[PDB]
Amino acid sequence: SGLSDFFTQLGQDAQLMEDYKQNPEAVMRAHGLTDEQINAVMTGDMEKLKTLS
């Protein structure tokens, strides 16, 4: 899961959203997203995301 579990938590939890918006990269890595995944998010490449998990 990972990406799914993270996206699920982020989307439901206002406190996690807060933490996320302050330092997206760190929070994503803390939740076990890969450098590729993190990069896809920060670049806004939704397509590459689909093809990661």
Partner: protein, 255 residues
């Protein structure tokens, strides 16, 4: 048994209503018509007894008519209800908006004497107002399916915010069709009138698409199924001096 149709809204996990989520949790069986795999994974963890109705669509590049497939979906839902199962259908956005299968199933369930209802959810339109920071009530609002707008005579009120949905398939019974839409809209809106291409976000890490461009450029824009066209007002509101007169007042009396 019984039937309840709920929506997930647009955003993963977070946009579903508290009660709607609860309905999924406590269902004997869930029929899903969810768009993506994140959505699917999330649902499966709420309730393991999930049937993906997307399976009824054409598979392995087979040929299959929509109306036949909707019928199979609906029949699959009703079979659960008839069997006596507390059945929940999980749709995207608002379950009664761009959604024939919900309406059909609920209709058929009622006719067979089963309890059946639709729970409202957050639609793409609800998201649009929030994201663009526009109140439909500010100067009024009109929404049409883009193709309906082209096939039938729907004169817009240009003081309102006009929304044209499913812009990506406008005029399908391409830049050619969109150009025809431009010429149509150009009856009321100048070619340099700024319009907005809107796509609601579905992931919490994802920004909504809010692309401002002149009307004339619409044909050269890349569109997705979810794309919508916002056309802001071309005219300011003007006083209805007749009705104000009947009311025995003037513009100066408006507090």
């Amino acid at each position: 048994g019984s039937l309840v149709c709920v929506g997930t809204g647009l955003q993963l996990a977070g946009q579903i209503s508290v009660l709607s989520r609860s309905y999924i949790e406590h269902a004997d069986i869930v029929f899903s018509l969810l768009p993506d795999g994140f959505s699917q994974r999330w649902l499966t963890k709420l309730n393991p007894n999930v049937i993906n109705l997307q399976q009824f669509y054409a598979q392995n590049g087979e040929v299959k008519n929509r109306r036949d497939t909707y019928e199979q979906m609906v029949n699959a839902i009703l079979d659960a209800v008839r069997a006596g199962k507390k059945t929940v259908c999980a749709l995207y956005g608002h379950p009664g908006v761009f959604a024939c299968v919900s309406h059909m199933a609920i209709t058929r369930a009622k006719a067979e004497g089963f309890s059946a209802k639709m729970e409202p959810g957050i639609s793409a339109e609800a998201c649009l107002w929030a994201d663009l920071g526009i109140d439909p009530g500010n100067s009024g609002h009109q929404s049409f399916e883009a193709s309906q707008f082209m096939f039938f005579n729907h004169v817009p009120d240009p003081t309102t915010h006009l929304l044209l949905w499913q812009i990506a398939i406008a005029g399908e019974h391409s830049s050619d069709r969109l150009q025809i839409l431009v010429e149509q809209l150009n009856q009321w809106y100048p070619l340099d009138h700024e319009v907005v291409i809107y796509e609601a976000a579905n992931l919490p890490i994802q920004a909504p698409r809010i692309e401002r461009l002149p009307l004339a450029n619409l044909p050269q824009a890349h569109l997705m199924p979810i794309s919508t066209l916002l056309i802001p007002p071309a005219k300011k509101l003007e006083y209805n001096y007749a009705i104000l007169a009947k009311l025995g007042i003037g513009p100066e009396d408006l507090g």
